[PDB]
Amino acid sequence: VQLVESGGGLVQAGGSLRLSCAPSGRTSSTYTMGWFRQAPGKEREFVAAISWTGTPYYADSVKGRFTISRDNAKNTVYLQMNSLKPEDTAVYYCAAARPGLFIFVSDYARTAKYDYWGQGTQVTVPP
Amino acid sequence: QVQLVESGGGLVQAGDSLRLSCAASGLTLKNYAMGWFRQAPGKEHEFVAVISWSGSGTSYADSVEGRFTISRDNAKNTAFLQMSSLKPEDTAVYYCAARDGGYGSRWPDEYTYWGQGTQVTVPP
Amino acid sequence: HPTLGVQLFSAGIAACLADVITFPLDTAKVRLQVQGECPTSSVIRYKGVLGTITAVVKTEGRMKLYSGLPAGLQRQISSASLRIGLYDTVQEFLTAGKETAPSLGSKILAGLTTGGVAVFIGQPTEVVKVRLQAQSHLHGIKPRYTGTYNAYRIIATTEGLTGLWKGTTPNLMRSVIINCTELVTYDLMKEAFVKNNILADDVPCHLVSALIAGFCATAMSSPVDVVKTRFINSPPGQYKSVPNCAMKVFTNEGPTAFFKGLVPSFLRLGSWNVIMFVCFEQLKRELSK
Ligand SMILES: O=c1ccn([C@@H]2O[C@H](COP(=O)(O)OP(=O)(O)OP(=O)(O)O)[C@@H](O)[C@H]2O)c(=O)[nH]1
């Protein structure tokens, strides 16, 4: 399974961006999809996830600002990012996980729970 | 050619203990459940106790449960009935019966072979 | 056209497999429920699932756990093939009418329709299964059937063809209670876990909430299942009516009696449904190829 992220770019503070993740190959609509980000020199942090049932989950740093959605007919996942701030500048990675790997809500934030990862897309918010 | 011979009956006092024996011939006892029945004067057969082919399963009438103990010796082709704390109401003829199945039954008409019986008497 | 035949055949075979494996639990359930009825019993003799099973194995023997089994298999072939195999078709009929009820209400109405039809057709086989499971050479009323086909012959001769449907109405009430309670409790328990962020909305949370729903559906089923087992098992005239049976159970034994057999009933419901669903899916998929 290959994941391709798109929609990255440069946006002014307070602006909005929409990321897209397109899975290819033996992709199943039953896969949980998640978004992670890694700022320069920083560890990879969880951003948002959407279960195969469509239930969205968000990190506290992005709660109320980012909205994840899924188009099951296109197997495409979207991440709408509003009220972007300079601290949101990072590479955003799309991830996919097989069904049944998530027991607790905190499990969505564990990088090791995702079987497939994209190449990532850079998002930059100048000061 | 099959015969069951009961022994051990007799006259005992209330509170005494008695052991009945049932010797089988013409059959391999380990293939038959062995049951004990009793018949008071002028009454029909009353179920007393039964033991499965292996002896791991036993059942007793409510009137004798806790007082009587049934056992068997497949190597000696003999079944036994240990009776403790005998009471006047235990006075009856005791019959041994074999059921052509490993497991027991409380119904006399379900047993294939029957002994001649032994008298047990408990004066008041 | 052929996939409906595959659905029916798969549901029948998967139900037969699950019934074979779970059937000792069924005999333990029935013997715990009839145990309260047994007249003039000086003490209990069945307690626990494994204690009941071992008591039956030691005194009566292993085959006695199976004693009702051919009527169980006939119930799975006739009743469960229709009940499970037709569910998708009836849910489709209701989905074409999707404005008439919510999705939950549609699942309920499909379940009630297929369960009612399947209980009506099933009932002779349940009367035979229950009567053969309850009967013992060491308890209660004398055994009156030498297995399943003799049970059908004797019931149909003695009690007429109408007699084989004895206890249809408690069995309908039980199946309605199971379907409504299990579907409602599953969706409410899934909502409770996910909406409060207690569990991840993934297969573990669904399996946990399905276990809770299946227990609650067994608990609600249980009073009606006790009265059903007793009424079906009873010779004619022992109970004047099903409410007379329920009133007698409550009057002499008290309210704890209705739950008798609850633990093997739950274990069988869950294990049977798991084995059935797994085998039904796998066989349906493999045969569909
Ligand atoms: O609608 C239903 C009916 C039945 N079942 C469950 O499927 C299993 C086999 O379904 P059966 O068709 O054998 O049920 P039964 O009425 O004979 O009931 P039991 O004595 O076996 O309990 C049993 O465990 C039953 O509770 C359901 O889960 N849902």
Side-chain angles (χ1 to χ4, degrees), chain A residues 1 3-9 11 13-23 25 31-37 39-41 44 46-59 64-70 73 77-84 86 88-97 99-106 108-109 111-112 114 116-118 120 126-127, chain B residues 2-61 63-75 77-124, chain C residues 2-39 44-97 101-239 241-289:
Chain A
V1 173
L3 305 180
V4 181
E5 304 92 335
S6 62
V11 65
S16 299
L17 283 176
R18 182 177 179 142
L19 310 184
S20 303
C21 175
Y31 289 7
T32 289
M33 301 298 296
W35 285 97
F36 291 77
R37 70 185 182 184
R44 189 179 296 183
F46 174 69
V47 180
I50 191 163
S51 72
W52 62 269
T53 59
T55 305
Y57 300 93
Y58 304 102
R65 300 192 302 121
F66 294 10
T67 302
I68 190 168
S69 62
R70 185 174 191 161
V77 173
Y78 307 100
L79 182 68
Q80 179 66 39
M81 305 185 297
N82 299 329
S83 306
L84 282 164
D88 298 308
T89 296
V91 180
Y92 288 72
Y93 301 92
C94 179
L101 296 179
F102 302 95
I103 303 173
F104 304 105
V105 174
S106 57
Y108 289 102
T111 54
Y114 297 85
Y116 310 106
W117 292 84
Chain B
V2 174
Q3 291 187 282
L4 301 180
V5 179
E6 302 94 337
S7 61
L11 175 64
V12 295
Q13 301 301 313
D16 287 349
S17 299
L18 196 59
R19 189 189 193 214
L20 308 184
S21 299
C22 173
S25 63
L27 62 73
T28 299
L29 203 82
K30 68 177 181 181
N31 296 332
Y32 295 78
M34 301 302 295
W36 286 92
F37 295 83
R38 69 185 181 186
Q39 186 175 34
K43 303 188 74 173
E44 298 296 329
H45 283 141
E46 177 191 16
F47 170 71
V48 177
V50 67
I51 187 164
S52 67
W53 67 278
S54 64
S56 62
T58 58
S59 190
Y60 304 98
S63 60
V64 307
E65 191 165 22
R67 298 190 301 119
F68 291 13
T69 299
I70 187 170
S71 63
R72 62 188 296 149
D73 189 332
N74 290 340
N77 62 46
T78 305
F80 309 97
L81 183 69
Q82 177 67 44
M83 304 184 295
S84 300
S85 302
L86 282 163
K87 303 177 179 181
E89 55 261 46
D90 295 318
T91 295
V93 178
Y94 283 71
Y95 301 83
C96 176
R99 185 172 191 267
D100 200 337
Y103 306 104
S105 172
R106 298 188 174 193
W107 305 97
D109 60 0
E110 294 189 8
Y111 287 80
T112 307
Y113 305 112
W114 285 78
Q116 292 292 292
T118 189
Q119 176 73 47
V120 174
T121 304
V122 188
Chain C
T3 194
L4 175 60
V6 170
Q7 279 181 340
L8 291 164
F9 179 84
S10 183
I13 297 297
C16 294
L17 295 170
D19 195 32
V20 175
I21 300 159
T22 62
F23 207 91
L25 295 169
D26 198 14
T27 297
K29 192 267 289 188
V30 168
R31 284 183 176 226
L32 289 161
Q33 297 179 337
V34 176
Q35 171 174 244
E37 173 174 288
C38 286
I44 69 173
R45 302 192 186 283
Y46 303 129
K47 185 176 180 288
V49 179
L50 184 62
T52 306
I53 289 170
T54 53
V56 177
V57 167
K58 294 283 181 178
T59 62
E60 304 209 303
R62 293 184 176 97
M63 296 198 294
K64 222 76 180 182
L65 300 174
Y66 299 100
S67 187
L69 182 67
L73 297 174
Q74 288 167 347
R75 190 163 171 91
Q76 305 322 325
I77 292 163
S78 62
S79 191
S81 184
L82 272 54
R83 190 229 306 171
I84 304 195
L86 301 174
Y87 185 88
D88 185 36
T89 291
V90 179
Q91 171 64 353
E92 179 173 20
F93 295 163
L94 298 173
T95 299
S103 306
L104 175 57
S106 188
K107 288 186 300 181
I108 288 170
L109 181 59
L112 268 53
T113 299
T114 53
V117 174
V119 161
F120 199 84
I121 299 162
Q123 191 65 20
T125 67
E126 186 163 7
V127 172
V128 173
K129 190 200 71 156
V130 169
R131 285 179 179 198
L132 291 173
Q133 284 173 333
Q135 75 171 13
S136 167
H137 302 269
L138 304 175
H139 289 258
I141 298 179
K142 189 177 190 179
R144 63 237 212 218
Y145 312 124
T146 309
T148 291
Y149 312 103
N150 183 256
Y152 289 115
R153 186 64 175 201
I154 295 181
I155 298 164
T157 304
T158 307
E159 305 187 45
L161 294 174
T162 178
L164 285 163
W165 276 264
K166 189 174 191 175
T168 307
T169 51
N171 206 7
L172 288 169
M173 183 175 172
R174 185 196 170 210
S175 303
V176 169
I177 287 166
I178 294 163
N179 282 282
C180 300
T181 305
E182 196 171 16
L183 294 171
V184 173
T185 307
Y186 172 74
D187 271 314
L188 268 55
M189 193 58 51
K190 187 195 78 194
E191 274 288 328
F193 294 148
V194 175
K195 193 57 52 64
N196 298 292
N197 297 308
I198 298 169
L199 296 177
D201 192 12
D202 188 18
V203 180
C205 178
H206 304 165
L207 181 60
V208 173
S209 52
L211 287 168
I212 300 298
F215 179 76
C216 297
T218 305
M220 301 292 289
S221 159
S222 189
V224 187
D225 186 48
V226 162
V227 173
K228 180 182 58 64
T229 289
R230 289 183 180 207
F231 193 76
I232 288 178
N233 180 241
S234 68
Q238 175 171 15
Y239 301 115
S241 186
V242 188
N244 171 251
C245 179
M247 187 222 74
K248 285 174 62 170
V249 172
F250 178 74
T251 297
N252 51 45
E253 296 178 65
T256 309
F258 294 126
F259 298 92
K260 287 180 176 182
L262 171 64
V263 179
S265 188
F266 169 50
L267 266 54
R268 173 162 159 104
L269 188 155
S271 189
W272 186 101
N273 280 287
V274 168
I275 297 164
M276 180 287 305
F277 180 83
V278 171
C279 298
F280 175 56
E281 282 291 303
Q282 187 268 353
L283 198 172
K284 180 159 52 79
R285 292 166 184 256
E286 180 63 11
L287 188 60
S288 185
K289 292 173 183 173

